[PDB]
């Protein structure tokens, strides 16, 4: 096997968001079929179990989105996990290969190209050119390694990390993209799983273009609901007293931003940025006030609240990294071949795209993956009855923008033999355990992690107030 020495843990710098934790890297081969070839260093962050008598092993935590550093989940989990989980597990997060602190890639993409997923198009021809230019730039700069940026290669890295940690059976928690990494790792290596929690569950049948199409459906429906919520708040927002009037104001605002970016605290906010910010805020009903605030401010030429501004600054300001967009490109284009027929995209722009107009065209048109210059290395992972994980708990919000609840139900079908599902009804949220703070969900998931017992049948919990 590829050599996996025990990690060289050191205190995290107090110049990092990981202050207070421990850091190390694990070597992995770029090509797992060529262990004598080039390697990279995968960054880890650890919060050691608080209680030696309660410690049962390691809770490995994957990234929640391609390109998003999974090490940064560790502080969030220290903040929000039930205390007994933090007593019983070393929490170890990682930055997946070619992201974060794990050999991040830089390809000369401009900020507009960083938003290739959500980029608002003009027509099929211009968008094909825009999306192909992203691919060209990335392969020119990183074409030697991009073919090795896939979900299955990340899963292989997870198993090297497990071996380096010295755990024959390791536990796992992953959210969103991390749910998919966990599922893939269990399908490839599940005899090495202890307890596994997958939260906000990607539908395997959606990998990946269908997920984009579903984003447009989910966004449209959520925006229709938010427009009603905003119409009831015309006193404070002055956006209209019925949902069509509110939506027309937002559409006109976003169209203006498509033609000339809106200055917001000195940041040029174009339509792609505004619609992405909108979708993110829509995904949590606790954030709907931020959305009312930015739309009110931008429509009326007034100032948004400082907290709203700081949310835009966090999303698009100094901390935004090109490397995340390149990581998204590799995973989302590389895991499966996208349709190559331009007529598919023409059809779907006029159909799906027009039926879901807020982001439908951005989702349905000729994305980068259509132009990918290498074949798929491997089939997409097939989850099924041969999965060797002893047990998997699925946790899912009933109303989840980014990973609709149908995906958790699909996972519960594909992995019928070893899964149980906990659904949080009444929640409008993405990433539930533990960040939403629901006592019922958090205690059910903690009890599974600490005792290994799945609930007797799938459970629907009612979101506490």
UniProtKB/TrEMBL annotation:
Ranges where the record places region Disordered: 1-15
Domain AB hydrolase-1 stretches: 67-422
Pfam families: Abhydrolase_1 (PF00561)
Keywords noted in UniProt: Hydrolase, Signal
Signal listed as a keyword: yes
MF (Gene Ontology): hydrolase activity
UniProt record similarity statement: Belongs to the peptidase S33 family.
Name by which UniProt lists this protein: Secreted hydrolase
Annotated source species: Streptomyces sp. (strain CB03234)
């Amino acid at each position: 096997r590829f050599s996996a020495p025990r990690p060289s843990w050191r205190p995290a710098g107090d110049d990092t968001p990981l202050a207070g934790l421990e850091c190390a890297t694990v070597t992995v081969p770029v090509d797992h079929a060529r262990p004598d070839g080039p390697t990279l260093e995968v960054a880890l962050a650890r919060h050691p179990a608080r209680s030696a008598g309660r410690r049962r092993g390691v809770l490995l935590v994957g990234p929640d989105d391609p390109g998003n550093p999974g090490t940064l989940l560790v502080p969030q989990l220290v903040r929000d996990l039930p205390a007994d989980v933090l007593d019983g597990y070393d929490v170890v997060g990682f930055d997946h290969r070619f992201s974060g602190g794990s050999a991040p890639l830089s390809c000369g993409l401009t900020p507009d190209q960083w938003l290739w997923i959500f980029h608002r198009p003009q027509d099929v021809e211009s968008e094909a050119r825009f999306q192909r230019a992203v691919v060209e730039r990335c392969f020119d700069a990183a074409g030697d390694v991009l073919p090795y940026l896939t979900s299955r290669d990340i899963a292989r890295d997870m198993d090297v990390i497990r071996r380096a940690l010295g755990e024959d059976r390791i536990s796992y928690l992953g959210h969103s993209y991390g749910s998919y990494l966990g599922a893939v790792w269990t399908q490839m290596f599940g005899e090495h799983a202890d307890r596994v929690v997958l939260d906000s569950v990607i539908d395997p049948s959606s990998v990946w273009r269908r997920m984009f199409l579903d984003y447009a459906v989910s966004c449209e429906a959520a925006l229709e609901r938010w427009a009603h919520w905003a119409a009831e708040r015309d006193g404070e927002l002055d956006l209209g007293r019925d949902a069509p009037t509110v939506r027309a104001a937002l559409d006109a605002l976003a169209g203006r931003a498509d033609r000339e970016p809106l200055p917001v605290a000195g940041m040029p906010v174009d339509g792609t940025m505004l619609r992405l910010f909108t979708m993110v805020l829509l995904s949590s009903d606790r954030a709907w006030g931020f959305l009312g605030d930015i739309v009110r401010a931008a429509v009326h030429g007034d100032e948004a609240a400082p907290s709203t501004l700081r949310a835009l600054g966090a999303m698009f300001g100094r901390g935004k990294e090109e490397s995340g967009a390149v990581a998204q490109l590799g995973v989302l284009c590389g895991d499966a071949a996208w349709p190559r027929d331009m007529e598919v995209y023409r059809r779907d722009l006029a159909g799906h795209g027009a039926r879901h107009p807020f982001i439908g065209p951005a989702m349905a048109g000729p994305k980068a993956g259509a132009f990918w210059p290498v074949p798929p290395a491997e089939p997409v992972t097939v989850l099924g009855a041969d999965n060797r994980a002893e047990s998997v708990l699925l946790v899912q919000s009933e109303q989840d923008m980014f990973t609709p609840a149908r995906g958790a139900r699909r996972m519960r079908e594909l992995l019928a033999h070893n899964t149980r599902l906990v659904t949080l009804a009444g929640a409008v949220q993405h990433r539930v355990f533990p960040f939403h703070g629901d006592p019922g969900v958090n205690r059910a998931a903690a009890a599974y992690l600490l005792t290994g017992k799945l609930p007797d049948t799938d459970l629907t919990l009612r979101a506490a107030a």
